[PDB]
Symmetry: C2
Subunit: 139 residues, 2 copies
C-alpha cells in the first residue's frame, strides 16, 4: 500500500484466493463457531461495526504452533490492512496479542472492532508465520 | 475512516488547518532541524519511502508534558491514518513509543518509515493528548 504501513510479514498475495463470502457457521461441542474447522475459529457472535466486542477464540488444531498471535484485516475491495485488536481497554488497535499461545491454550478471549460494515478477511499469523484466513461479516 | 482502525484519541479534525507544504528547516545549536521551533523537532534528515531511518528527535519545549509519545501520520489527500514507528528491529509499525518522555528527555532516536513518497503530516500526542503537528517530505 502507498497509504499505510503494515507488518513486514504481511503480503498482499494472501488475498489471491479469498472467497468473498461469509464463512459458514459450524457446531463444535454444541456451540456455534466461525472459522476453519479443526484449526482455528471464533464464537459465532454478531460483529457490529465500531463496537468493541469481546469474542472467544478457539484453537482447534491439536498441533497449533507456538507464538504470539497476529490478526491483520482487510475489507472487501481494500488493499489497506488494519489491526483490529483493542486489548484490555486499550485506546490503540494492535496487530498482535501480548501473550504467547501454543497447543495447550485451547481458548482465548479477544476484544475486536471493525471500522465499517461489510465483509472483512481475517489473516492469521502465529510467531509471524502465516497460519490461515477466513471471512466474517460486520453489521 | 471506513477502511482502518485508529487510536481513539485520533480525530480527523486535526487535518483542518494543515498547510500542505514541507515544514522549513531551522538551526538550533548549529544543526539543522525540522518541526516546530521551541517545541518539538526532528533532525533534518532525508526521508526515503520504504527505508527505515533512525532519526533523532528533539524536545525543545522546556515544559514538555510527561507521557508515552505517539505519532500518527497521514499522507496528503488521505483520511487513512498510519503508524510509522519501527522500533528496535520490530517487524510491526507502532503508534506509540514504549518509553515515557518528559521535560528532561531532551532527545530520543526514533526509527521511522513512510510507505510512499510525497507529503505527510505528522500528528504528535503525548500521554494520548494532542501536542502538535508538522509536515515532512518523503522522497
Amino acid at each position: 500500500s502507498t497509504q499505510v504501513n503494515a507488518p513486514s510479514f504481511f503480503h498482499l498475495s494472501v488475498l489471491k484466493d479469498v472467497n468473498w463470502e461469509e464463512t459458514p457457521s459450524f457446531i463444535q461441542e454444541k456451540i456455534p463457531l466461525k472459522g476453519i474447522e479443526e484449526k482455528i475459529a471464533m464464537a459465532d457472535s454478531p460483529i457490529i461495526a465500531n463496537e468493541k466486542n469481546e469474542i472467544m477464540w478457539y484453537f482447534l488444531d491439536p498441533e497449533m504452533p507456538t507464538g504470539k498471535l497476529s490478526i491483520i484485516a482487510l475489507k472487501q475491495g481494500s488493499v489497506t490492512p488494519t489491526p483490529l485488536l483493542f486489548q484490555q481497554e486499550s485506546s490503540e488497535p494492535t496487530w498482535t496479542t501480548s501473550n504467547t499461545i501454543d497447543s495447550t491454550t485451547n481458548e482465548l478471549p479477544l476484544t475486536m472492532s471493525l471500522p465499517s460494515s461489510g465483509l472483512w478477511v481475517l489473516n492469521i499469523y502465529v510467531n509471524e508465520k502465516y497460519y490461515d484466513q477466513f471471512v466474517i461479516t460486520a453489521e
